[PDB]
Design a binder for these strands. Structure first.
Ligand SMILES: Nc1nc2c(ncn2[C@@H]2O[C@H](COP(=O)(O)OP(=O)(O)OP(=O)(O)O)[C@@H](O)[C@H]2O)c(=O)[nH]1
Ligand SMILES: Nc1ncnc2c1ncn2[C@@H]1O[C@H](COP(=O)(O)OP(=O)(O)OP(=O)(O)O)C[C@H]1O
Ligand SMILES: [Mg+2]
Ligand SMILES: [Zn+2]
Lengths: 54, 739, 99, 125, 298, 422, 149, 50
RNA sequence: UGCUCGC
């Protein structure tokens, strides 16, 4: 998903610190360590079994 | 000639030169007067339009103006000093033909049934066709050549017109303008226009999951670069700015300043910034990005042929632009003459009166009206075919040509995209009347019952909108733009604000317009797909009168029609009493119109006045046109534009290069109500013959007809052809003359 | 071409010249066919315009009735006299010596 | 979250609970009054010209009607744009020309919009 | 007949879909001999024309199927130890569409023209689970290139011909037997013929350039003749076969299909005067003056 | 739909009219507040309101990267300069929030404090949007530029004393053209300098948890009785509508409203010119019941005549002395004589023959047809009949007017017999 | 698209059944029917249109597109896919066409006109190219077609 | 043609050889069928079929 | 050169 820093509002990227993977902003020292699993499903559209025409 | 010319004169009331300060030329008031002829030696004389037709001269009136200036620092005033000659349109306010009786028309050798409205220049009759163009200051979402669904906005102010585009060529939105070397990401422009937080940008774009998924690549591309502040974005933009070929003057580090000026003034001119506050411009570009994102899914691509986005320029606006250009050129020439004469001539103080050439404006107007090519360098408009020779084949020919409308496409190729008959032409333009040939579909005719709106003051509209609960856009963030119940209200392409429960707003605005506190030509429409409330008040829009229907019963009753027939009330009384109102194409898009009384249902808002008003003037001659095929009606209109018959009551004194008259014209037996309205029965263009439909002698195989010899011998079909032969005996430079 | 409007106009014009009236061919309206048919049957003519006609050449009646009626014909500016053209050797152009 | 209505809003603000609430309502440009001895002209009459005390009543009719009787005329009150960002109503009092006090009065959650009932004003005269 | 052709519509040739350019635009595309044409049609015959299962199987074999079209969900999971993208294949939809695609085939589909993904990055945990762990490439790329994968990971081809965009199962309802054929809206005839279960001996195509490049110049001539005759018959007007045969022979007498445009006309003809008179007058005249090419009056 | 419940009163308070500001954070949701964040200072200007908050953020929290903090602190400021430092320590400790002005006038906006049975309104002196400002990066870029200049100067270990004496480059104070002067005035740099000319004012922060907040919260209320009749706010709905909507500033040209705005005599004249045939009751209904009948009668007696109980406009009204026949061009006096003869024939008999009038008046067919169409209709086998029926009620109600019109018609008949030799 | 096809099928059923009924009820010696039988001019379709019922007005092989928002004309309801609201002409040329039917017929006529206008120039250019390319070939006496070279 | 105002051109050869070639190759009786498919174009028309 | 037409 798209996450933003509460401090300045810029987009957060995922990097690796010294202990664990964390969300971080490129314009402020704000970080956020990941505790549990985080997922972002999209559920793409499944191509239907097209009918035989003619 | 009564309002716009005074505004143009006021806009350029004072002209002065840089050299020798405290010198100026101030215009006070300009007059056009009555048409006169300069034949007499330094004396004017009233001249009739027929005399101008005979003498191969122009029918114009002297444009004079009263001024005040400084010759030797002493104020000198002139109360009546002519400066040009404006060609006077026939049957206008200043035309001699207006307010005249048919007897007085006979005294002036002019037909009372002549439609007028055409200029007479050098003896020829020129008509300025109604120009059709796309509406300005409007977002257009369209697919590109490669299939990319982008956006375009042609922001046009009184000074500059700039078309800025936005593309999604690589999954991210780039903004393209003629003042930028390379298209730059939209997020950089967002950061340059004051809003630096990406969260605010995303909120302004939209809060839908698919919207964020589509806008993700743009944010990623912006984060790839080190652009995070307004200064960095402005520097990046200035790096993409190219000088207009070594603009005169020391730059002195104008890069960031040039970028900010292009963002504030050049980009999105119609969106105004109070004092370098791009909040409105940010909201506008965010709404545009949201529209592009929404259109990138379901193919809801807007169509150019929709006449709700079309504008019609009459002769008034064209003449206003031309007069403004000519007056600016005259002022520049006067300033140049002053700069050249005043500082070095003599103690004899220079005065503009000795240099105010009066032939400039006159020659400009005459050439622009006669040749028909208009070249406005101040607006960079190069148009051709604006004026056309009035066709005097018949009365129907001129009457139909007077209500013609040309297309901006200016046919040179097979477009086949505006040539189609769009359903938006209902009640506004004639569907059947079109020239058969290469100009099929791009030259059209107005309907029998139609009107073209003018410009309004737009003040009370804003006041009523602000008083009706429209929240200011600067007070709230863009996230409210993503709510399903929040509807955007616009005004001539400018974001007027946001609103909730737009039904109440629309009903109150329509009721206020019906009451008379708002101009009856101000249109209001609602788009539920985009959730946008459009308020249109610019001129050129097509409107049509419709009877208001409230609760399955029309407001117009038999008593009102009886009062109208007896003369108690007029159409203006119907307009004021909330009985009949004008509807625009955008407004009628949301309204429900009933063709007849029996078709009125519960969900009906308006009633059609008369269905046969759908056809135009030429199509009105067709008896029982609904029983025939549409190509037959088109061919009939085309041939009736060439029908032979009488022209007017002054056709004998009239001398044209080619005239066709009928010996014994007869009015038709099966006449349409349009014929009675246009008074065609007074000037017929045909004869009634006892036709028998049968095959005879095989000399009528394919479309041919057999004529009776005795009928032709007794005057049937007898015609007269009048040609003109003109010769000139002019005096040359030497004292010798043609004899 | 399916020009039934021409037949309706012919019938209305015949009825009008019979009863001394001017029928209306207004779009999406006008005089109906029943009214002009009644006007024709009242004046002693056929209710469909077709009348008994004898051939002028042979002097014998035609096997089928002929559809007679007043039609508003209009002459066009396209004349054969103005469009007739014939070219002799004649003049040629200076640049390219062609007609 | 379903879109609430002003009538039920006030009902739950007074009947369901008794805690006070800070609201932000938007009044029209001109109020149906005259500036009292303010040296004039039919100019705009805002709250800065009116005095303290009772200036109007709030009526809640049936079927969800929420009106504001400000004298002879009656406006209608509707729900404004549902703001979700933080809005803090504070008092910035400059008691001294060199040092002032900023007093956080509370938080703003709901927004109201007051509009003239133009239909009634038109059918009246 | 071009003037006689009305440029009609609704002529879907019995399938009620697959809008194909027919008429004057079709004749123009044929005579221009363009390498890429609009709406290319390939007719493929089946070995088992009576079985619908085999028809759908060969359709899935030939039709390009993206990863997102078969995967039920793709989620970027950021575990405390590592972050990676997990793709769940919908085996139910796989067996419904009869695609011969498993976790191993999907893994083999990855690491092909995707930022050079190493084979160790992609892994398989379950029967229909694919785990992708990208690494920073140091070419202006970090771990937060995961998003880039999210932009194109579902858009990777796992089975089918990349040039093939859409293939449908057409059926002929002859009274003797109802047979099954493939209608492919692609621009790759060789791949369609090379696929298993497709009777390549009776496979035709509309693009004359592909037929020329794949089956020779005579097959291209026959295809041109058949396509022109079919396009002419579609409008109800008939032309003698000798005219279209002469046209195809003129287009295919130098060993290469040369169009009627200025380029093909220059490659075929040699007369300088005709090349100058048709198109590009000044260019052809100056080139002839440079070459000193003597032009006869033949 | 009656006001069954919730008859809440509305009070007004002017205590904090000039001291009430509205701060909204477009990037901070309402869930998270700044109550726990210790603030440090607030810069503000009385005129051209633009407040800049300076707050403090913690460091020992796990949500802070100390390495990136040291990096950004070394980037924005110098090594150990500390003369003008955006951060006191070697870490990013202070945060700046800048305000943008939403609108110029905030008179239509008000804060509403709701108590049990009452709603207190307080005007807002200004509304500003607070957003996280990025100003340390600009100072960081300036310091990077000065460090680049220092590195350029340090290309050599020992720099000789440069003879870079500042030659006197005093530029001409050129008289600027008015267009260029307007461009300079409208420039962004000039506006920013004008804004910076106003001195800053420092303010301390008092949070919601502070007792001063609850102390000053009572100022939004006003001391007053429950029921008080407001002296103002007493204008009628029509006056309110006129206030909120101030104004901008054939012969049937004038509409009905424009007619009613004219004096009664002009109204009667225009109505008789337009219709030319109408009863007295219809005129009374059109003009309105609020107008006395005697005035309407006196007005119509000057521009109309009595024919068979109805009123027909006079001939001279339709045809002024300078007008002429639009069909024949004859003077208006002959038209008036002919119309008077037609009206006299109608008074004598209800049926009028067109041929007799054409023979007597010696006028053309079109003029007689226009004269008859104004007051008559064609009846087959009977000629021309007056369009309105005999109105005996008005005759019975006003016998004196009938006698006056009778003697006037006698005089007109004498004149017509003298002229046309009847 | 299935609903569109079904509605077109039903309208065509109405049209063809009305035409068959008109052809069956017509008596011999009828001049339109006589000229249609011999094929000199016209056909049964034109007779059915001018006598029984006009067919569905088709633009680009489909019903009338929605020129306005979610509807072709404001005289019909929004999202209304009724036959009369999409181009069907219930009345014939004899009984007279309603304004909407006349507008749809004029749309179809203008579409045909612009189609022919484009076709003229397109086929002119195609003919020019084809003749300029093929004018060199000639049949020799040895029964072999050879070019100019 | 349809005899609704169509203008047609008429050329006169100035050579006996050209006249003979026109009469033989372009004779009306010798071009009764089109070379496209051999169908006869010069045949009966309206008012001749009926 | 422009434009309105004629098929
Ligand atoms: N504006 C304008 N340009 C013309 C006119 N006649 C010719 N031209 C221009 O001249 C070119 C064609 O020249 P022609 O019409 O062959 O001139 P011409 O008829 O041989 O001249 P003469 O030998 O004097 O008869 C065009 O490209 C036009 O731009 C005209 O009447 N007005
Ligand atoms: N631009 C053009 N190019 C070539 N020929 C043309 C052009 N315009 C008209 N013509 C001539 O006119 C003829 C066109 O008539 P056609 O289209 O068949 O009937 P129509 O004009 O549709 O008449 P209806 O409307 O069917 O009564 C054929 C052609 O020789
Ligand atoms: Mg023709
Ligand atoms: Zn951050």
């Amino acid at each position: 998903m798209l996450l933003f820093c509460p401090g300045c509002g810029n987009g957060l990227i995922v990097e690796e610190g010294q202990r664990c993977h964390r969300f971080a902003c490129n314009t402020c020292p704000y970080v956020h360590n990941i505790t549990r699993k985080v997922t972002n499903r999209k559920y793409p559209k499944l191509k239907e079994v097209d009918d035989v025409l003619g | 000639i009564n309002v716009e010319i005074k505004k143009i004169m006021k806009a350029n009331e004072k002209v002065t030169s840089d050299a020798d300060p405290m010198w100026y030329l101030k215009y006070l008031n300009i007059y056009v007067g009555l048409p006169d002829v300069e034949e007499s030696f330094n004396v004017t004389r009233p001249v009739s339009p027929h005399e101008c037709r005979l003498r191969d001269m122009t029918y114009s009136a002297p444009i004079t103006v009263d001024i005040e200036y400084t010759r030797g620092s002493q104020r000198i005033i002139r109360n009546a000093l002519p400066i040009g000659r404006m060609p006077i349109m026939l049957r206008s306010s200043n035309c001699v033909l207006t307010g005249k009786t048919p007897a007085e028309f006979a005294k002036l050798n002019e037909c009372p049934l002549d439609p007028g409205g055409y200029f007479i220049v050098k003896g020829v009759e020129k008509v300025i066709l109604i120009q059709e163009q796309l509406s300005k200051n409007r977002i257009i979402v369209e697919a590109d050549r490669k299939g990319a669904v982008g956006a375009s906005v042609t922001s046009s102010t009184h000074e500059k017109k700039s078309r800025t585009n936005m593309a999604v060529k690589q999954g991210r939105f780039y903004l393209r303008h003629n003042t930028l070397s390379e298209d730059i990401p939209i997020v950089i422009i967002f950061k340059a226009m004051g809003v630096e937080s990406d969260q605010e940008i995303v909120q302004m774009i939209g809060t839908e999951e698919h919207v964020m998924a589509a806008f993700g690549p743009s944010l990623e591309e912006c984060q790839k670069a080190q652009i995070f502040t307004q200064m960095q974005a402005l520097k990046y933009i200035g790096n993409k700015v190219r000088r207009q070929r070594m603009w005169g003057g020391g730059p002195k580090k104008t890069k960031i300043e040039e970028a900010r000026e292009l963002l504030a003034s050049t980009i999105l001119t119609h969106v105004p910034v109070k004092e370098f506050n791009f909040r409105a411009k940010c909201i506008y570009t965010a709404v545009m990005v949201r529209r592009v994102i929404l259109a990138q899914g379901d193919n809801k691509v807007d169509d150019r042929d929709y006449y709700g986005n079309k504008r019609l320029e009459l002769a008034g606006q064209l003449l206003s632009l031309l007069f403004e250009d000519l007056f600016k050129k005259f002022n520049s020439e006067m300033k140049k003459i002053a700069d050249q004469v005043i500082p070095k001539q003599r103690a004899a103080q220079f005065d503009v009166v000795k240099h105010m050439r009066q032939d400039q404006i006159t020659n400009g107007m005459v050439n622009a009206i006669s040749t028909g090519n208009w070249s406005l360098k101040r607006f960079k408009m190069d148009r051709q075919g604006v004026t056309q020779v009035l066709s005097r084949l018949s009365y129907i020919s001129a009457l139909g040509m007077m209500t013609r409308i040309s297309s901006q496409f200016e046919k040179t190729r097979k477009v086949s995209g505006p040539r189609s008959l769009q359903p938006s032409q209902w009640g506004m333009l004639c569907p059947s009347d079109t020239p058969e040939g290469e100009a099929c579909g791009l030259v059209k005719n107005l309907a029998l019952m139609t009107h073209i709106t003018t410009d309004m003051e737009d003040g009370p509209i804003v006041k009523l909108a602000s008083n009706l609960g429209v929240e200011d856009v600067n007070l709230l963030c863009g996230e409210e733009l993503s709510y399903p119940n929040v509807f955007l209200v616009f005004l001539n392409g400018n974001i007027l604000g946001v609103i909730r429960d737009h039904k109440k707003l629309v009903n109150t605005f329509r009721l206020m317009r019906r009451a008379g506190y708002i101009n009856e030509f101000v249109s209001i429409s609602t788009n539920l797909t985009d959730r946008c409330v459009y308020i249109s008040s610019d001129g050129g829009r097509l409107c049509r009168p419709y009877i208001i229907v409230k609760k399955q019963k029309p407001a117009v009753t038999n008593k009102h029609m009886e009062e109208l027939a007896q003369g108690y009330r007029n159409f203006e009384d119907f307009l004021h009493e909330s009985l009949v109102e004008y509807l625009d194409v955008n407004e009628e898009n949301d309204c429900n119109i009933a063709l007849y009384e029996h078709t009125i249902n519960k969900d009906t808002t308006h009633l059609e006045i008369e269905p046969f008003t759908l056809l135009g003037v030429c199509a009105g001659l067709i008896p029982y046109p609904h029983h025939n095929q549409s190509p037959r009606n088109t061919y009939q209109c085309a041939m009736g534009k060439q029908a032979m018959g009488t022209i007017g009551y002054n056709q004998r004194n009239r001398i044209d290069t080619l005239m066709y008259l009928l010996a014994y014209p007869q009015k038709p037996m099966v006449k349409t109500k349009t014929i009675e309205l246009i008074e065609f029965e007074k000037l017929p263009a045909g004869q009634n013959a006892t036709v028998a439909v049968m095959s005879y002698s095989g000399y009528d195989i394919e479309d041919a007809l057999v004529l009776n010899k005795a009928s032709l011998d007794r005057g049937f079909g007898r015609c007269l052809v009048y040609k003109n032969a003109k010769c000139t005996l002019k005096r040359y430079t030497n004292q010798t003359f043609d004899k | 071409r399916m020009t039934v409007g021409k037949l309706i106009e012919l019938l209305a014009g015949k009825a009008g010249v019979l009863d001394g009236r001017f029928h209306y061919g207004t779009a999406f309206g006008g005089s109906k066919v029943k009214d002009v048919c009644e006007d024709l049957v009242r004046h002693g003519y056929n209710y469909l315009g077709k009348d008994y006609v004898t051939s002028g050449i042979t002097g014998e009646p035609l096997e089928a009735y002929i559809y007679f009626g007043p039609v508003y014909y209009q002459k066009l500016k396209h004349m054969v006299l103005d469009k007739m053209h014939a070219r002799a050797r004649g003049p040629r152009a200076v640049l390219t010596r062609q007609p | 979250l379903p879109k609430d209505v002003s009538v039920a809003e006030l009902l739950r603000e007074l009947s369901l609970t008794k805690e006070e609430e800070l609201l932000f309502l938007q009044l029209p440009d001109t109020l149906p009054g005259q500036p009292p001895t303010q040296d004039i002209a039919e100019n705009a009459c805002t709250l800065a010209d009116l005095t303290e005390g009772q200036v109007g009543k709030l009526l809640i009719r049936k079927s969800g009607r929420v009106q504001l009787l400000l004298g002879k005329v009656t406006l209608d009150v509707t729900m404004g744009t549902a703001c979700s960002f933080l809005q803090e109503l504070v008092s910035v009092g400059l008691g001294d020309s060199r040092t002032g006090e900023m007093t956080v009065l509370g938080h703003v959650k709901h927004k109201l919009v007051c509009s003239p009932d133009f239909e009634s004003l038109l059918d009246h005269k | 007949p071009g003037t006689q052709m009305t440029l009609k519509t609704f002529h879907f040739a019995g399938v009620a879909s697959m809008n194909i350019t027919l008429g004057v635009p079709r004749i123009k595309e044929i005579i221009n001999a363009s390498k890429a044409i609009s709406t290319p049609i390939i007719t493929a015959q089946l070995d088992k024309d009576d079985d619908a299962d085999y028809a759908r199987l060969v359709k899935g074999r030939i039709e390009k199927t993206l990863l997102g079209e078969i995967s039920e969900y793709i989620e970027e999971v950021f575990l405390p130890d590592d972050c990676f993208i997990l793709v769940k294949l919908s085996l139910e939809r796989i067996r419904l569409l009869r695609l011969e695609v498993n976790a191993e085939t999907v893994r083999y589909s990855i690491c092909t023209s995707k930022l050079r993904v190493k084979p160790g990055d992609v892994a398989v945990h379950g029967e229909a689970v694919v785990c992708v762990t990208p690494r920073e490439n140091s070419k202006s790329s970090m771990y937060y290139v995961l998003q880039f994968l999210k932009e194109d990971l579902p858009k990777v081809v796992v089975q089918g011909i990349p040039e093939v965009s859409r293939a449908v199962i057409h059926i002929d309802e002859q009274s003797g037997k109802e047979k099954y054929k493939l209608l492919v809206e692609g621009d790759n005839l060789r791949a369609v013929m090379a696929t298993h279960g497709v009777k390549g001996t009776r496979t035709t195509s509309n693009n004359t350039y592909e037929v020329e490049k794949t089956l020779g110049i005579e097959a291209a001539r026959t295809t041109i003749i058949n396509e022109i005759q079919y396009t002419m018959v579609n409008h109800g007007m008939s032309i003698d076969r000798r005219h279209v045969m002469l046209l195809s022979d003129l287009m295919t007498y130098k060993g290469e299909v040369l169009g009627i445009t200025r380029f093909g006309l220059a490659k075929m003809k040699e007369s300088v005067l005709m090349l100058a008179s048709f198109e590009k007058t000044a260019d052809h005249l100056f080139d002839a003056a440079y070459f000193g090419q003597k032009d006869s009056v033949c | 739909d009656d006001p069954v419940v919730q008859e809440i009163d509305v009070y007004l308070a002017k205590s904090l009219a000039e001291k009430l500001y509205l701060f909204q954070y477009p990037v901070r949701p309402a869930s998270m507040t700044y109550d726990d964040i210790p603030h440090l200072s607030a810069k503000i200007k009385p005129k051209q309101q633009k407040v800049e908050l300076e707050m403090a953020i913690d460091t020992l929290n796990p949500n802070y990267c100390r390495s990136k903090g040291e990096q950004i602190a070394l980037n924005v400021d110098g090594a150990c300069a500390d003369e003008t430092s955006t951060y006191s320590s070697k870490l990013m400790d202070k945060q700046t929030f800048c305000s943008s002005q939403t609108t110029s006038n905030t008179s239509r906006y008000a804060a509403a404090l709701y108590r049990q049975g009452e709603l207190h309104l307080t005007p807002l002196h200004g509304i500003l949007q607070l957003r996280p400002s990025f100003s340390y990066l600009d100072k960081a870029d300036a310091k990077h530029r000065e460090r680049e200049a220092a590195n350029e100067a340090g290309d050599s270990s020992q720099d000789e004393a440069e003879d870079d004496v500042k030659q006197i480059t005093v530029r001409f104070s050129r008289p600027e053209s008015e267009q260029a002067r307007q461009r300079r005035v409208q420039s962004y740099e000039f506006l920013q300098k004008k804004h910076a000319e106003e001195p800053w004012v420092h303010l301390h922060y008092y949070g919601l948890r502070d007792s001063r907040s609850e102390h000053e919260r009572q100022y939004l209320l006003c001391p007053g009785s429950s029921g008080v009749e407001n002296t103002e706010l007493v204008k009628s709905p029509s006056e309110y509508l006129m206030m909120l909507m101030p104004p901008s500033q054939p012969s049937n040209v004038l509409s009905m409203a424009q007619l009613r705005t004219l004096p009664l005599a002009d109204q009667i004249k225009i109505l008789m010119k337009n219709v030319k045939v109408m009863p007295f009751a219809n005129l009374m209904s059109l003009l309105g019941p609020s107008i006395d009948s005697v005035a309407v009668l006196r007005g119509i007696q000057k521009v109309a005549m009595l024919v068979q109980g109805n009123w027909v406009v006079k001939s001279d009204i339709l045809y002024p002395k300078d007008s002429s026949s639009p069909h024949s061009g004859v003077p208006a006096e002959v038209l008036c004589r002919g119309r008077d003869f037609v009206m006299w024939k109608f008074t004598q008999s209800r049926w009028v023959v067109r041929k007799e009038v054409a023979t007597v008046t010696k006028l053309c067919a079109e003029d007689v047809k226009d004269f008859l169409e104004h007051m008559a209709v064609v009846r087959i086998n009977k000629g021309w009949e007056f369009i309105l029926p005999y109105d005996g009620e008005f005759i019975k109600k006003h016998p004196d007017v009938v006698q006056r019109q009778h003697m006037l018609w006698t005089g007109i008949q004498a004149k017509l017999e003298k002229v046309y030799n009847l | 698209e299935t609903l569109e096809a079904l509605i077109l099928k039903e309208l065509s059923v109405i049209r063809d059944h009305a035409g068959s009924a008109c052809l069956r009820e017509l008596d011999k010696s009828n001049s339109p029917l006589t000229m249609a039988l011999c094929g000199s001019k016209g056909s049964f379709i034109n007779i059915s249109q001018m006598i029984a019922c006009v067919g569905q007005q088709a633009i680009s092989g489909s019903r009338v597109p929605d020129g306005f928002e979610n509807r072709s004309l404001p005289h019909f309801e929004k999202h209304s896919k009724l036959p009369a609201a999409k181009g069907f002409v219930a009345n014939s040329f004899y009984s007279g066409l309603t304004p909407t039917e006349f507008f749809f017929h004029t749309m179809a006529g203008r579409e045909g006109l612009v189609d022919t206008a484009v076709k003229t120039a397109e086929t002119g250019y195609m003919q020019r190219r084809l003749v300029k390319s093929l004018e060199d070939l000639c049949s020799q006496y040895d029964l072999t077609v050879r070019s100019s070279t | 043609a349809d005899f609704d105002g169509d203008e047609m051109n008429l050329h006169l050869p100035q050579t006996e050889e050209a006249k003979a070639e026109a009469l033989v190759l372009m004779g009306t009786k010798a071009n009764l069928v089109t070379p496209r498919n051999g169908e006869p174009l010069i045949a009966a028309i309206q008012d001749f079929l009926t």
